[PDB]
């Protein structure tokens, strides 16, 4: 159990793009972003 959970590498007899190009352009409507946009609209309206 400790060999598999410990941060030290296990011993084994020895014998690519993985990152987002840009997550700023690929925008997805989020719940929090919806409440933030609504807050921007309400502030834009109380401050006319």
């Amino acid at each position: 159990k400790s060999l598999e959970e410990d941060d030290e590498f296990e011993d084994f007899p020895i014998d690519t793009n993985i990152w987002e190009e840009n997550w700023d352009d690929v925008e997805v409507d989020d719940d929090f972003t919806n409440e933030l946009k609504a807050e921007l609209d309400r502030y834009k309206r109380e401050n006319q």
């Binding site: 941060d7 030290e8 590498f9 296990e10 987002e20 409440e35 933030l36 807050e39």
Partner: protein
């Protein structure tokens, strides 16, 4: 047949087939040796080694042989503790036979030394777990092993500038092996800063012209430990290039064992938060074989909170994940360095609709204060949480100008501040990247890491 005389012949001619502390490989021969060596005092064993024919005229080598005879004579296979003095004594003598570069049978002794090193590390952990019952301080055995391996590491010299041969001496063949073993020991004894001497003297001692010329597995483990060290010193970019190159090199390895998958998981456990601090988010495709779906879901929740500017989200995620993040030394650095990315995305979404869509060049402090009221949520001052916490004591929506000032100083927001006007002026434009540039490029330009390929 006299088995002690036979063993002394083998050892005198560099045949170390039975020279090992592992009784699972040496049990029967060591038992016969123990029955035949019973009777003889220490001086008689020392004389057996001293007067043996063809024995190398090396005091440290003869001390090693005599120490192995004492071990074989007095070993108690039923008690690992009672035999520990013989085992560790013989191990120290064996490593002492490696300090001299021209020691007798050095090339044949090196594999023996690595084997016995793994054995004695396992036994040292085993005995350190019983430090209270053994009346020893914490990590005493393994620290002793670390001292031995440290002297061995110091004895390894850099190559002669005009060397006469391409022979890789076995002390150079195990250089990176010894570095990773020693640094792993320093991590397990919970004193990882001791790696600093080991990291500083690794490349100067190496004869290899390129770091990629070592075994790629040792390269992966070295980049893993170096990244963890850098991260212990809050150097996020330096750690990130090491975790990243480590995981790429692991992606090149053929997936022979399950332990390779778990090692990749160990790399990702640090590469995901380190990358996220630098404004980088993984594509889970190439990470499916190394991460469970629940881990991906967790880091994806944190990804959403950071991506859309939810500080309260980030602090809640760190609060729920506090215990395993502290175990991997991850909580503090994330608590400190995720907020500025989250703020960056918050004011990113604010400036997008406010400036590029609604055509307002000015950002009043009141607007950003309401936005921070939504993002931060509750603070130490607010009721319902009357005790201060790392998750409610740091961030407050009152400090609009401070957040803006740190965003501009980190190069994450290109804007001017007006404190007496209480507003923040950005450039009148429809392109949002001119106001809020890509965060990873800005961070990496302000904090240039060392060469990801070491040498």
């Amino acid at each position: 047949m006299d088995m002690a005389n036979q063993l002394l012949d083998e050892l005198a001619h560099g045949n170390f087939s039975h020279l090992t502390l592992n009784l699972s490989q040496n049990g029967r021969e060591i038992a016969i040796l123990q029955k035949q060596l019973t009777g003889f005092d220490d001086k008689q064993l020392e004389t057996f080694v001293e007067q043996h024919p063809a024995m190398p005229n090396d005091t440290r080598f003869k001390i090693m042989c005599t120490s192995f005879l004492n071990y074989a004579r007095d070993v108690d296979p039923w008690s690992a503790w009672s035999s520990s003095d013989l085992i560790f004594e013989f191990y120290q003598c064996l490593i002492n036979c490696l300090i001299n570069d021209n020691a007798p049978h050095i090339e044949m002794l090196i594999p023996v030394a690595t084997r016995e090193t793994e054995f004695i590390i396992n036994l040292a952990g085993k005995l350190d777990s019983f430090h209270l019952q053994l009346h020893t301080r914490s990590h005493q055995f393994l620290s002793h092993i670390s001292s031995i391996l440290s002297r061995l590491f110091n004895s390894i010299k850099p190559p002669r500038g005009n060397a006469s041969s391409t022979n890789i001496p076995g002390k150079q063949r195990i250089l990176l092996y010894l570095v990773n073993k020693l640094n792993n020991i320093y991590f397990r004894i919970e004193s990882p800063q001791l790696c600093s001497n080991i990291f500083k003297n690794f490349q100067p001692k190496s004869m290899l012209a390129h770091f990629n010329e070592y075994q790629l597995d040792q390269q992966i483990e070295y980049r893993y430990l170096l990244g963890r060290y850098y991260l212990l010193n809050s150097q996020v970019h330096n750690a990130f290039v090491q975790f990243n190159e480590a995981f790429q090199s692991l992606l090149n390895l053929p997936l022979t064992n399950q332990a390779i998958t778990r090692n990749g998981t160990r790399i990702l456990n640090y590469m995901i938060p380190t990358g996220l601090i630098l404004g980088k988010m993984v594509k889970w495709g190439p990470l499916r074989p190394f991460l469970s779906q629940e881990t991906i879901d967790n880091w994806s929740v944190l990804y959403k909170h950071v991506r859309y500017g939810n500080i309260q989200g980030v602090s809640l995620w760190l609060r729920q994940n506090e215990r395993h993040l502290c175990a991997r030394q991850l909580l503090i650095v994330l608590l400190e360095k995720l907020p500025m990315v989250t703020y960056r995305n918050l004011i990113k979404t604010v400036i997008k609709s406010w400036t590029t869509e609604w055509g307002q060049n000015k950002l009043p402090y009141s607007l950003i204060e309401r936005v921070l009221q939504l993002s931060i949520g509750p603070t130490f001052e607010d009721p319902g949480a009357q005790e201060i916490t790392i998750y409610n004591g740091i961030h407050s929506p009152k400090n609009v100008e401070n957040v803006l000032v740190t965003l501009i100083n980190l190069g994450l927001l290109r804007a001017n501040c007006f404190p007496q006007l209480q507003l923040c002026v950005v450039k009148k434009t429809t392109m949002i990247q001119e106001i809020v540039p890509p965060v990873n490029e800005r961070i990496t330009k302000m904090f240039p890491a060392h060469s990801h390929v070491l040498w």
